[PDB]
């Protein structure tokens, strides 16, 4: 049959400053050090572009959230000027990129996807 998530690629939401921003709420915790979408408001460019709550950010506005901090994620968004691109993944999508040794960057959703048995793909890990 047809599989709803056989195209396992991160969704890209593009929104621009409307009211006091892009229309999404980022939550920060002393347990979850990374940033995640807490809430989206109906009348927002974020909601319109297909962003939801409880979505997690892997890249924002072309910047990679590879262990990035609160200041880093804000820097990525603010550097976009008046508009931003949000990459979010659900647990199903998140695990796939991890197991394939790759960050779910925008290049994967638009272009090529990695492969299993990722011993053939020479990941550049050296030193301990």
């Amino acid at each position: 049959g047809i599989d709803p998530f056989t195209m396992l690629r991160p969704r890209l939401c593009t929104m621009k400053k409307g009211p006091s921003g892009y229309g999404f709420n980022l939550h920060s915790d002393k347990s979850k050090p990374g940033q995640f979408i807490r809430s989206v408001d109906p009348d927002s460019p974020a909601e319109a572009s297909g962003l939801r709550a409880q979505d997690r950010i892997v890249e924002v506005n072309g910047v990679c959230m590879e262990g990035k901090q609160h200041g880093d994620v804000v820097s990525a968004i603010r550097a976009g000027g008046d508009e931003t691109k949000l990459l979010v993944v659900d647990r199903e999508t998140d695990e796939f990129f991890k197991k394939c040794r790759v960050i779910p960057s925008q290049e994967h959703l638009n272009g090529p996807l990695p492969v299993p048995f990722t011993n053939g793909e020479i990941q550049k890990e050296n030193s301990r």
Partner: peptide, 5 residues
């Protein structure tokens, strides 16, 4: 606290 955008 949070951060809204």
């Amino acid at each position: 606290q949070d951060t809204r955008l």
